Amino acid sequence: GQVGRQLAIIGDDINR
Amino acid sequence: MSMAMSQSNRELVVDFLSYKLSQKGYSWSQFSDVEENRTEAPEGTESEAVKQALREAGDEFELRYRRAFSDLTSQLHITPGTAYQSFEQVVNELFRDGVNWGRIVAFFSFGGALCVESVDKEMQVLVSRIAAWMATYLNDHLEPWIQENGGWDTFVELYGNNAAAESRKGQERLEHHHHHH
């Protein structure tokens, strides 16, 4: 499973 | 003074999948809550600013997911039997220890994606499946963490309309803003 591990990466570039 | 704090949860998940499938060209009630006998609700006020930040945050999270790696369901297979397991792996992934903002929005558009490709793969029953897994995870793990400190008013305060771009532009003060004069 690759999803989830990357779904959090984008969070940084779009965190609040 | 309650009224729809727990019922509103299933209202946010159901509204996210309604506009999600509506985007491509498929109906939602066609294979979801088809059973008549509804409640109608008073009107829905939390979904106003909440759903708003969920639409701009869901389209920006998706654009950044393929623009940074690839599609989500495209990598999944989807099927009535091992579908809940797929979304179960992506869920634990986001949860690194507790519940931090950001993973909630990515989870909203994520499940909506599996619902779209699901109908295209002749999996109507699969759609309703993700509908119960979305309203459940929201009313189970995200329930005791959202009501803790206004999880909807806060999720909108950090992901309001165009909040993602407002974090780099609206910053100004501690960002660098050269206009002290």
Swiss-Prot record, chain A:
UniProt tissue specificity: Expressed in a wide variety of tissues, with highest levels in the heart and skeletal muscle.
Subcellular location: Mitochondrion outer membrane
Highest rank taxon of the organism: Eukaryota
Family per similarity comment: Belongs to the Bcl-2 family.
Function in brief: Plays a role in the mitochondrial apoptotic process. Upon arrival of cell death signals, promotes mitochondrial outer membrane (MOM) permeabilization by oligomerizing to form pores within the MOM. This releases apoptogenic factors into the cytosol, including cytochrome c, promoting the activation of caspase 9 which in turn processes and activates the effector caspases.
Name assigned to this protein: Bcl-2 homologous antagonist/killer
Assembly notes: Homodimer. Formation of the homodimer is zinc-dependent. Forms heterodimers with BCL2 and BCL2L1 isoform Bcl-X(L). Forms heterooligomers with BAX. Interacts with BCL2A1. Interacts with RTL10/BOP. Interacts with VDAC1. Interacts with GIMAP3/IAN4 and GIMAP5/IAN5.
From Swiss-Prot, chain B:
Effect on the protein of changing residue 153 to A: No effect on caspase-1 cleavage
Ranges in coiled-coil conformation: none
PANTHER family membership: BCL-2 RELATED (PTHR11256), BCL-2-LIKE PROTEIN 1 (PTHR11256:SF12)
A GO term for molecular function: protein kinase binding
Similarity comment: Belongs to the Bcl-2 family.
Tissue: Bcl-X(S) is expressed at high levels in cells that undergo a high rate of turnover, such as developing lymphocytes. In contrast, Bcl-X(L) is found in tissues containing long-lived postmitotic cells, such as adult brain.
NCBIfam families: bcl-2
Residue ranges annotated as motif BH3: 50-64
Effect of residue 102 to A: No heterodimerization with BAX
Residue positions of motif BH2: 144-159
Disulfide bond sites: none
Subunit note: Homodimer. Interacts with BCL2L11. Interacts with BAD. Interacts with PGAM5. Interacts with HEBP2. Interacts with p53/TP53 and BBC3; interaction with BBC3 disrupts the interaction with p53/TP53. Interacts with ATP5F1A and ATP5F1B; the interactions mediate the association of isoform Bcl-X(L) with the mitochondrial membrane ATP synthase F(1)F(0) ATP synthase. Interacts with VDAC1. Interacts with BCL2L11 (via BH3). Interacts with RNF183. Interacts with GIMAP3/IAN4 and GIMAP5/IAN5.
Post-translational modification: Proteolytically cleaved by caspases during apoptosis. The cleaved protein, lacking the BH4 motif, has pro-apoptotic activity. This phosphorylation is partial in normal mitotic cells, but complete in G2-arrested cells upon DNA-damage, thus promoting subsequent apoptosis probably by triggering caspases-mediated proteolysis. Phosphorylated by PLK3, leading to regulate the G2 checkpoint and progression to cytokinesis during mitosis.
Keywords: Apoptosis, Cytoplasm, Cytoplasmic vesicle, Cytoskeleton, Endocytosis, Membrane, Mitochondrion, Mitochondrion inner membrane, Mitochondrion outer membrane, Nucleus, Phosphoprotein, Synapse, Transmembrane, Transmembrane helix, Ubl conjugation
Reported impact of residue 112 to E: No heterodimerization with BAX
The keyword RNA-binding appears for this protein: no
Motif BH4 in this chain: 8-28
Motif BH1 boundaries: 93-112
GO biological process, one term: negative regulation of extrinsic apoptotic signaling pathway via death domain receptors
UniProt domain comment: The BH4 motif is required for anti-apoptotic activity. The BH1 and BH2 motifs are required for both heterodimerization with other Bcl-2 family members and for repression of cell death.
Protein name: Bcl-2-like protein 1
Protein task: Potent inhibitor of cell death. Inhibits activation of caspases. Appears to regulate cell death by blocking the voltage-dependent anion channel (VDAC) by binding to it and preventing the release of the caspase activator, CYC1, from the mitochondrial membrane. Also acts as a regulator of G2 checkpoint and progression to cytokinesis during mitosis.
GO cellular component terms given for this protein: Bcl-2 family protein complex; centrosome; cytoplasm; cytosol; endoplasmic reticulum; mitochondrial inner membrane; mitochondrial matrix; mitochondrial outer membrane
